[PDB]
Design a protein around this ligand. Sequence first.
Ligand SMILES: Nc1ncnc2c1ncn2[C@@H]1O[C@H](COP(=O)(O)OP(=O)(O)OP(=O)(O)OP(=O)(O)OP(=O)(O)OC[C@H]2O[C@@H](n3cnc4c(N)ncnc43)[C@H](O)[C@@H]2O)[C@@H](O)[C@H]1O
Ligand SMILES: Nc1ncnc2c1ncn2[C@@H]1O[C@H](COP(=O)(O)OP(=O)(O)OP(=O)(O)OP(=O)(O)OP(=O)(O)OC[C@H]2O[C@@H](n3cnc4c(N)ncnc43)[C@H](O)[C@@H]2O)[C@@H](O)[C@H]1O
Ligand SMILES: Nc1ncnc2c1ncn2[C@@H]1O[C@H](COP(=O)(O)OP(=O)(O)OP(=O)(O)OP(=O)(O)OP(=O)(O)OC[C@H]2O[C@@H](n3cnc4c(N)ncnc43)[C@H](O)[C@@H]2O)[C@@H](O)[C@H]1O
Ligand SMILES: Nc1ncnc2c1ncn2[C@@H]1O[C@H](COP(=O)(O)OP(=O)(O)OP(=O)(O)OP(=O)(O)OP(=O)(O)OC[C@H]2O[C@@H](n3cnc4c(N)ncnc43)[C@H](O)[C@@H]2O)[C@@H](O)[C@H]1O
Ligand SMILES: [Mg+2]
Ligand SMILES: [Mg+2]
Ligand SMILES: [Mg+2]
Ligand SMILES: [Mg+2]
Lengths: 277, 277, 277, 277
Amino acid sequence: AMNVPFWTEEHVRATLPERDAESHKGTYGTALLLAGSDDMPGAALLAGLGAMRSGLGKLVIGTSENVIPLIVPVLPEATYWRDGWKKAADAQLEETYRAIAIGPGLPQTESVQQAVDHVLTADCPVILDAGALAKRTYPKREGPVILTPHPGEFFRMTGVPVNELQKKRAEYAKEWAAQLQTVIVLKGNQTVIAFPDGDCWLNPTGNGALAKGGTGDTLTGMILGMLCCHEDPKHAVLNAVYLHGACAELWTDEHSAHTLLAHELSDILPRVWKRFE
Amino acid sequence: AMNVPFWTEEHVRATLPERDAESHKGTYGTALLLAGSDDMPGAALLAGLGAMRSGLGKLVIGTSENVIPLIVPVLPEATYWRDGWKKAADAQLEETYRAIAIGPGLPQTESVQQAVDHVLTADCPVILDAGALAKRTYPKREGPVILTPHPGEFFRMTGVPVNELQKKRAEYAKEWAAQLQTVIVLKGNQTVIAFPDGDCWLNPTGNGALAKGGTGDTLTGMILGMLCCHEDPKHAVLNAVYLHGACAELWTDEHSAHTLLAHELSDILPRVWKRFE
Amino acid sequence: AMNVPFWTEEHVRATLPERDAESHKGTYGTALLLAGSDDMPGAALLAGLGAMRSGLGKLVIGTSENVIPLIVPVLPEATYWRDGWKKAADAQLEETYRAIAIGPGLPQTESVQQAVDHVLTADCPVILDAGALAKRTYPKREGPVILTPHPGEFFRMTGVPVNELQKKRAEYAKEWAAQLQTVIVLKGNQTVIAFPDGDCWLNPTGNGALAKGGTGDTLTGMILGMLCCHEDPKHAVLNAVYLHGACAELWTDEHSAHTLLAHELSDILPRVWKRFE
Amino acid sequence: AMNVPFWTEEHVRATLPERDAESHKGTYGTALLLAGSDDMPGAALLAGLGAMRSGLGKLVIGTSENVIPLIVPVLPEATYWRDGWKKAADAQLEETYRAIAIGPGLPQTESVQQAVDHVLTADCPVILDAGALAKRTYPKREGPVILTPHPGEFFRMTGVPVNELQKKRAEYAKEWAAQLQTVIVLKGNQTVIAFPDGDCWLNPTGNGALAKGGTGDTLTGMILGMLCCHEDPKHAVLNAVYLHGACAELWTDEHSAHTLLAHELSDILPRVWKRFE
Ligand SMILES: Nc1ncnc2c1ncn2[C@@H]1O[C@H](COP(=O)(O)OP(=O)(O)OP(=O)(O)OP(=O)(O)OP(=O)(O)OC[C@H]2O[C@@H](n3cnc4c(N)ncnc43)[C@H](O)[C@@H]2O)[C@@H](O)[C@H]1O
Ligand SMILES: Nc1ncnc2c1ncn2[C@@H]1O[C@H](COP(=O)(O)OP(=O)(O)OP(=O)(O)OP(=O)(O)OP(=O)(O)OC[C@H]2O[C@@H](n3cnc4c(N)ncnc43)[C@H](O)[C@@H]2O)[C@@H](O)[C@H]1O
Ligand SMILES: Nc1ncnc2c1ncn2[C@@H]1O[C@H](COP(=O)(O)OP(=O)(O)OP(=O)(O)OP(=O)(O)OP(=O)(O)OC[C@H]2O[C@@H](n3cnc4c(N)ncnc43)[C@H](O)[C@@H]2O)[C@@H](O)[C@H]1O
Ligand SMILES: Nc1ncnc2c1ncn2[C@@H]1O[C@H](COP(=O)(O)OP(=O)(O)OP(=O)(O)OP(=O)(O)OP(=O)(O)OC[C@H]2O[C@@H](n3cnc4c(N)ncnc43)[C@H](O)[C@@H]2O)[C@@H](O)[C@H]1O
Ligand SMILES: [Mg+2]
Ligand SMILES: [Mg+2]
Ligand SMILES: [Mg+2]
Ligand SMILES: [Mg+2]
């Protein structure tokens, strides 16, 4: 209705970064993932895999202590900040990260918002998802804040009912990205990527294979890794949302859309990304 | 002998659901799986994988606390109700599920029957398998109750000896589905699917590759997921039993029937289901 | 030197069992595996996988309590007898098994020999490997006892030094199978399969890819499963040793012999077994 | 600048060992890996997999107690020395190993240097990586000591700043290999392999896919295994560094360089090694 343009294959091709011969892991940065709780452990593995698949140099996972041994056998490349998401409620981050994500598998509590407030005092892009999404405002800071709500979470953030939101998705997403001064990735079919400077795009990829628990946690991870290897954080977000949907389209060529498990998106990404190089 | 018809490829094709572009995980519902105990943990992973492979939107696994970390690395998409099957003995379910299964890897105890009684007060289809199968009757309720006995369990439910049962499988299964007012999936070669309204079918798929521990737990999961994405719960049951057997037939094209492990049925299902679309 | 014949492809083909349409898991029996200790946990997973791959109906793994959660995510089809190998020191088996193996990953202690003595009072074939192999004699019983020593273990059982053994492998293996009234599978290149009735064969398959920790534990499992689905326990042993070696030969077609991991033998067996049907 | 020659395909082909029909696991030795701590567990799995993939006969992993259950499901072929890296601080090794590696996932502490001092009294090649790398000297002993620093660790060992090092990598690496009387594998694009007798080579393989956490831990493991199956420990080091890089090149044929996870190097090695036979 606002004629929001699609982020197309040609855009993805023009903006995906190289991984030069002369580079080292430090070139691609260290990401911090604050995710996974004893009651919701899976989200940390889904987001960790998404992140390490997506071009970072190193990943530190600040998960609950009992979740760590569940990640190690599947993702032995990750390192840990034991109970990191809880500790981040109490102090500003001492270390420097290229990018930070918070929320997948975390409860919707005040202590999580305290961790968000401490994360936001860092100078790097920050992603807020799932339990870190709430009705709130954001401090002026250097790097972008990127909110990744599904329509239910957007309702929790804004009070726009889901049935009203879904009639004018790009219009509400743009309005609230402007108001909050955050990036908003408004999930669903034709995901809207709304920037606080008024740029806005639609994502043309993806299908109903994604309409299952865990696919959003994978995307959060993919955005986190992409923020580390793209110079322009806008291109990171756009490319992550695009390639995420493209992995689901690859799956449905020879597999039923009913049967995808989110972690498989991360297994498919290596081949899908290569096609856009 | 009663000329029970086979649920054929043509029936499966005509009744398998679409997964539309405009859908979200809520369209495909949340399933609850009450399965897995410290002594029999594997059943929860087999049934969880079967369920998440089979078109649901979300899965909550109410397993014993010590079983949770065994599922997470393999199925990080699942969420948990810690000690759920035990807690369900004490109270009616507060939350609303699209479908519920109970019994795989649970002991044949009175406390399991108490959990069954509480599950049955929900308005959704309910599957009873393994430890939840007993000699008992069922309350009038809205949604179907689906019993999935092998012949030994059918003997425990009815007192019909296995050697007598196996001579007239469809006749006993129909009689008892009518008497109990439950669906009965009477397992084995040519599994019988008997509905309490007197409809009855035979399953034409499957082979001896399935004659090994865990394949029934996988099927229970597959029925649970299919109940979430089919409008007609009859078609869910029939399609689950059919596709389960078809995965074993795909396996035996290039692998010996002696060597299948149940969890591999769930890995094969994505490709097998696609063939029937 | 004694012109011991090779168990050939033609023998394997003529003796491998069918898995009939009308069968159920009970047709293929329940195996018991007494393996894996806190200090040597891996052996239980290697042998469990070998066994469930090899045509049994059900597997009960009597492993140490802390080893159970290490097996479940990889082999959720197995069931458990918690601390089974330890408990078997104290009482005769109450339950009936189709076949039993003891020793992989168990210490060479008197308590393990006490468990062996209790196992031998069952009427089924029994495999003794690794920690269950000692200098001892065997009681007259119904079913075969099958010892699976490498040359070092054969030295521990008999006092024949390894350097003397390796000069006349079939002659020593036959002599001691006769003396002990046990089957002896004397491992190595050209493994000798010596029966106490004086039959003896050489195994023609296998290569240096097998010369690495864990491949023997896999074989023990494979023999256990094969004992459950072959009518003739001699053919089970021979076919297990043969197919084990054939999986290593398949591997070396496209992979270096230096790089095989034992568990991969079990992943290869499905395709290799099919070729001999 | 010093015209250091490349270790080429032709060198690799001429020096990779055979795995003879008549061999047994004892022919290829037992390696000891002292790696992995509660805070950095993943390194033990990465290095263990690298080592068991690389032609050893047996592997003993001396890791922290809580790390053991994280390795077992992925690498059930490994055995353990519980808290081995800690215990090695207190006594000389009682057992004989073909080769030893220490440091991946260990803290940079004095107690780790005490374990290094005890390891060095063994007569076998010893690899020092990660936390075992420090500014220190080395005792005259029989077998080679092999240091595997990235440029940051080389700075910690020598005080040559990274920006100065990277201008004259081979010159600094040769000078310090001579001074310390250690092998130095100076990591990065065109990794330098400098021997204390003044031989020096460059590695021609590898790419930016390797510029991510965990790839060095995999290499340490690969060197450890290769030391066990090559007669000449120089050829082991060179071949390990070469094949490690070649696995990353195979990956990038059909997968994006951004998306490799280190453990996958070990999965690729079987096929890559075969190509050089
Ligand atoms: N459209 C909608 N209408 C009404 N209510 C809605 C709604 N969408 C969500 N909700 C609400 O959300 C709640 C259910 O999710 P919820 O349980 O709240 O989130 P969670 O507990 O943290 O874990 P999840 O089960 O959600 O999975 P996820 O977080 O990994 O999925 P996500 O949505 O982030 O990520 C899913 C990912 O998959 C993509 N995706 C999903 N379906 C498609 C599709 N059909 N085509 C293309 N892409 C799709 C998304 O863009 C995204 O990237 C309910 O309360 C419900 O009301
Ligand atoms: N036919 C029979 N005759 C006499 N006694 C019998 C019997 N079948 C079972 N029993 C009794 O059952 C007990 C053994 O099982 P049991 O131990 O009681 O069940 P469990 O402990 O909960 O776990 P399981 O080892 O049974 O495996 P499962 O539950 O995953 O298998 P299920 O049967 O549900 O699921 C197996 C699945 O595989 C399918 N399947 C099995 N074989 C074939 C085949 N040959 N062709 C096509 N489909 C097959 C089934 O239809 C089903 O979907 C014994 O006490 C025995 O007496
Ligand atoms: N030939 C020999 N000469 C002198 N000493 C020897 C010896 N073989 C073994 N030893 C002794 O054995 C000890 C080392 O093993 P050991 O540590 O004692 O056994 P473990 O601790 O229980 O676990 P492992 O590391 O042995 O592996 P495994 O039990 O899974 O292997 P297995 O041998 O059962 O099973 C290995 C499997 O792989 C097969 N295999 C091995 N190499 C080949 C080959 N080259 N060609 C064909 N098949 C082969 C075998 O037939 C068998 O099926 C040493 O003390 C050593 O002295
Ligand atoms: N070049 C550089 N310039 C400035 N500072 C540097 C630097 N390289 C490293 N650093 C320093 O190192 C620290 C970061 O690593 P660090 O965190 O200190 O090591 P760790 O905590 O023990 O675990 P890691 O995250 O390092 O991964 P790894 O040990 O498995 O990787 P490794 O380097 O051993 O092994 C990596 C492996 O991949 C190979 N590899 C990496 N990139 C390429 C490439 N582009 N082409 C070919 N091979 C490559 C290497 O040769 C090696 O085999 C920082 O403090 C940083 O200052
Ligand atoms: Mg979400
Ligand atoms: Mg069952
Ligand atoms: Mg052995
Ligand atoms: Mg390193």
